[PDB]
Amino acid sequence: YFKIYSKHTPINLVRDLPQGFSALEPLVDLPIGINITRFQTLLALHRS
Amino acid sequence: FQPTYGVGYQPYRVVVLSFELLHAPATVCGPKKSTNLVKNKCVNFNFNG
Numbered sequence: 660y661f662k663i664y665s666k667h668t669p670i671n672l673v674r675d676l677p678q679g680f681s682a683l684e685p686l687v688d689l690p691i692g693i694n695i696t697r698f699q700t701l702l703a704l705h706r707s
Numbered sequence: 708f709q710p711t712y713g714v715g716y717q718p719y720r721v722v723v724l725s726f727e728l729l730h731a732p733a734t735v736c737g738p739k740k741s742t743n744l745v746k747n748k749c750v751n752f753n754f755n756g
């Protein structure tokens with residue numbers, strides 16, 4: 660089972676993580692049934 | 708394939724369903740037949756398992 664918990668938070672701090680408490684709600688459970696040992700974030704370029 | 712041909716030389720549309728039985732997380736389930744809800748009585752309740 661792949662559990663994804665998530666939370667959206669409106670912040671106004673510039674640089675670092677804000678200090679506070681926010682419990683993450685369960686969003687979606689995924690029936691994947693696969694081995695996972697490595698991950699990589701996906702970003703987006705800006706072209707001009 | 709002609710309509711005048713006898714049964715046995717006639718086209719048959721064949722659909723074969725294939726499943727795996729309870730070894731991985733499952734995505735396909737059969738329907739759930741929920742009954743009406745009765746309140747204020749001592750009943751045996753079954754809510755989402």
Ligand SMILES: *[C@@H]1O[C@H](CO)[C@@H](O)[C@H](O)[C@H]1NC(C)=O
Binds near residue numbers: 694695696
């Ligand atoms: C999952 O992958 C890792 C590294 O590839 C491996 O060491 C581990 O044995 C694998 N687990 C299973 C259940 O195959």
